[PDB]
């Protein structure tokens, strides 16, 4: 069921902007038209009312997005091969910092081409590309160039696939609605076979040059990755399990392969990365479990499961008709699927951030504290943005695609029927958490300021010991040998163990948890609960409330329903997204500040040859992170000295963005604190001045809309704050050393 040439390819409609919207195609009258145009481009459900054409547009846009990502990755490989020092870093890891951006000498900006090692002048890259390339077995610039060329070819393939699947041969609706096969094809297909292929790549290619570089072989003396597969004698030379071939695999004797597929745990004490044998065995187990999972649902042969029948069988005495109907929602509404996928992908990116620091999987990434901090913070911010988008598209589904006649006494209807109880209890939880975390900080600030340190909440005072987290850390410490008998080391040394001391620097130690950790974890719980409260109230009240009973008729994105009923501005689901964006921003700023301070205070530093570690901020987190003043002075004021004393050096760009973000945040407050009536009257005065000299434009200038004013405000606020924190974090962690 594939259509034949639905949409012709013509250059004429490119030159008439606003073709997709009926109102936009009449032409511009006010400037809002222009601002409507970019606002209305990707809302495919609003332009066309048929689900089929919306699905075609989404499929071709997905191919275009994949093309954009491939262009970005190809550029990264090209900048790592021509304008980088991957050659030179690879022979000497701990004398040379990674640098993959070379900047032209112009207007004095060549100062940013700093000395990174081996006669190189360029920006020290902190994305960790070198450590992943070492973990994959890369050893030459020509192979990185080949990967860049292949990425360009795959981007062209993605563009051609998008053009083909929109304009030439495009599928029908029941192709998209066949989700039973799509989940099997994504589990046993993409994830399972991709991890099987990467496990095969690990075992064959990434393991030999990695273990030879850890042994001490120069990178030029390791010949090339393909000559291993040319001659299997090299594997039996190095891993002596490669003597029986594929025979123990098919004959239930997998213990022969317990030489390159292991269960060690911990880190490799030459690099600080995870064990590559551990990661290959993990990838193989993940592949087998995912192949097994990708044969659950009936696709074409009558064997499997019906997801509809599974959902319809789940109902109880508390939940009425249970999960009746959710298959129809998730097969007809793109927005509902987008909401739940954004939630789980944001949670996954946050899980990735939290798992990557404590179990560093790349060689020499852990001792590069800039790379660790950058990766943690970047993945945290990506996850938080995706969770806000999840709340957004849940509200969008509630406004647009919800139907009450086709959800009667199921779970979703009962959510809507007890949303008051849900939101009121979440409100009480948020107030309780805000008091019993931030007021603990306020209590501590006041008692320290009053000269009563024995009355504070601290380890040397009234103690708040996180005893459950300590007990779980203890159980993880006694895991390898008692509850994990075949595991050699612990899953991570953050739970308890000994300090890995690759080079003179630290990679991981037991992260102890005291009163300050208790306080900051309950701060995290509080802020996550408030962001969840905002987004869940926006979802549950997107259609109606006691204030506005017809909110679904007003849409998802509307400023207000007027000054009446006391005032109803910011009632829409979009405005709940707007507020949840700031609260997610606050939550993640505190999360990454906790991470940066705890890692600099109790983990990172310099190891003495006797076995003692001098930390970066000398363990001040236990006594200073219990007050707001300690966070202001010992964390913000103290560590901002690197970003403000950067001028005249190679880090001075991090100074400039430290100013520049401070601009944009403040600029945001113009849009956030004001309203468009003032700006429209001011625009009237400037139009009168333009009328005097006959320079009045034909498109009439207007103030921005109320929604657009809020959008510009939140965008500039988040941009300025994130750029400020990025500049501060990077100039601190490129000067930690």
């Amino acid at each position: 069921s594939v259509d034949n040439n639905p949409v012709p390819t013509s250059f004429e409609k490119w030159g008439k902007p606003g073709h997709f919207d009926r109102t936009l195609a009449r032409g511009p009258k006010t400037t809002t038209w222009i601002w409507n145009l970019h606002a209305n481009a990707h809302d495919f459900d609003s332009q066309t009312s048929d689900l089929e054409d919306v699905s075609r547009k989404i499929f071709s846009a997905h191919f275009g997005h994949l093309a954009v990502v491939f262009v970005w990755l190809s550029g990264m490989y090209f900048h790592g091969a021509k304008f980088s020092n991957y050659e030179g870093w690879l022979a000497d890891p701990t004398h040379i910092k990674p640098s993959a951006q070379v900047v032209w000498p112009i207007v004095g900006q060549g100062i940013l081409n700093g000395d990174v090692g081996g006669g190189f002048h360029g920006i020290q890259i902190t994305s960790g590309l070198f450590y992943l390339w070492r973990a994959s077995g890369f050893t030459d610039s020509y192979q990185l160039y080949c990967t860049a060329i292949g990425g360009l070819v795959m981007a062209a393939l993605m563009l051609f696939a998008g053009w083909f699947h929109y304009h030439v041969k495009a599928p029908k609706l029941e192709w998209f609605q066949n989700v039973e096969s799509m989940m099997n094809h994504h589990l046993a297909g993409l994830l399972g076979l991709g991890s099987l292929g990467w496990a095969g790549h690990q075992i064959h290619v990434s393991m030999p040059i990695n273990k030879l570089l850890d042994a001490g072989v120069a990178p030029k003396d390791i010949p090339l990755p393909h000559e291993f597969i040319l001659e299997p004698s090299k594997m039996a030379e190095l891993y002596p399990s490669f003597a029986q071939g594929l025979t123990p695999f098919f004959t239930l004797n997998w213990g022969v392969y317990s030489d390159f597929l292991t269960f060690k745990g911990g880190l490799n004490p030459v690099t600080g990365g995870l064990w590559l044998s551990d990661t290959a065995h993990h990838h193989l187990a993940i592949a087998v479990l995912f192949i097994i999972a990708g044969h659950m649902y009936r696709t074409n042969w009558g064997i499997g499961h019906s997801m509809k029948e599974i959902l319809e069988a789940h109902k109880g005495p508390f939940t009425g008709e249970g999960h009746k109907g959710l298959y129809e929602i998730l097969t007809t509404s793109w927005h509902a699927q987008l909401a739940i996928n954004l939630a789980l992908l944001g949670s996954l990116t946050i899980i990735v951030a939290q798992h990557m620091y404590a179990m560093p999987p790349y060689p020499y990434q852990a001792i590069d504290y800039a790379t660790q901090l950058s990766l943690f913070t970047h993945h945290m911010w990506i996850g938080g943005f995706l969770i806000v988008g999840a709340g957004a598209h849940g509200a969008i589904f509630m406004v647009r695609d919800y139907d009450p006649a086709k959800n009667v006494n199921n779970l979703l209807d009962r959510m809507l029927r007890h949303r008051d109880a849900i939101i009121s209890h979440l409100n009480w939880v948020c107030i309780f958490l805000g008091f019993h975390s931030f007021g603990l900080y306020i209590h501590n600030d006041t008692m320290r300021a009053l000269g009563r340190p024995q009355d504070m909440f601290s380890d040397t005072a009234i103690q708040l010991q996180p005893i459950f987290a300590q007990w779980v850390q203890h159980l993880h410490t006694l895991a390898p040998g008692a509850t994990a008998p075949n595991a050699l080391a612990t899953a991570s040394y953050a739970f308890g163990g000994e300090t890995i001391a690759v080079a003179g620097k630290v990679a991981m130690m037991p992260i102890t948890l005291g009163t300050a950790d208790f306080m900051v974890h309950h701060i995290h719980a509080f802020t996550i609960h408030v962001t969840a409260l905002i987004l869940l109230k926006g979802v549950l009240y997107a259609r109606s409330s006691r204030l506005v009973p017809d909110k679904a008729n007003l849409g998802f994105r509307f400023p207000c329903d007027g000054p009446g009923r006391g005032g109803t501005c910011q009632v829409s689901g979009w405005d709940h997204v707007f507020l949840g964006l700031f609260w997610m921003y606050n939550s993640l700023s505190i999360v990454i500040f906790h991470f940066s301070w705890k890692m600099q205070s109790d983990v990172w530093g310099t190891v003495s040859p006797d076995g003692s570690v001098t930390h970066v901020t000398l363990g001040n987190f236990a006594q200073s992170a219990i007050t707001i003043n300690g966070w202001l002075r010992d964390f913000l004021w103290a560590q901002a000295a690197n970003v403000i004393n950067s001028y005249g050096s190679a880090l001075s760009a991090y100074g400039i963005m430290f100013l520049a973000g401070h601009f944009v945040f403040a600029f945001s407050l113009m849009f956030l604190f004001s309203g468009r009536g003032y700006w429209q009257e001011l625009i009237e005065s400037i139009v009168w001045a333009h009328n005097k000299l006959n320079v009045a434009p034909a498109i009439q200038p207007r103030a921005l809309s109320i929604i657009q004013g809020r959008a510009v405000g939140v965008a500039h606020y988040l941009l300025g704050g994130i750029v400020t924190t990025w500049a501060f974090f990077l100039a601190r962690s490129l000067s930690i050393g």
């Binding site: 006691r546 204030l547 506005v548 017809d550 329903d561 007027g562 000054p563 009446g564 009923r565 006391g566 109803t568």
Partner: protein, 80 residues
């Protein structure tokens, strides 16, 4: 209660009455316009002040005007 006034530029398009979510306005017969009808507000004690009727009005400098005044349970839109 809020005050809803209708001025003589009304052309009887009935859009303010259709836009009103609380049944404040009707259309009564008139002679000042070609439609021969003018909006009226007999039920301003039910008006919440949402100004949807003002948004619907097509006459330049709207013929219907809502003035927020005394605040009641009905006017603040309270279900409690």
């Amino acid at each position: 209660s809020h005050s809803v006034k209708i001025y003589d530029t009304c052309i009887g398009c009935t859009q303010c009455v259709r836009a009103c979510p609380l049944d404040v306005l009707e259309m009564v017969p008139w002679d000042g316009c070609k439609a021969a009808q003018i909006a009226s507000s007999p039920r301003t004690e039910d008006c919440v002040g949402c100004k949807r009727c003002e948004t619907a009005c097509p006459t330049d400098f709207l013929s219907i005007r809502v003035y927020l005044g005394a605040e009641t349970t009905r006017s603040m839109g309270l279900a409690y």
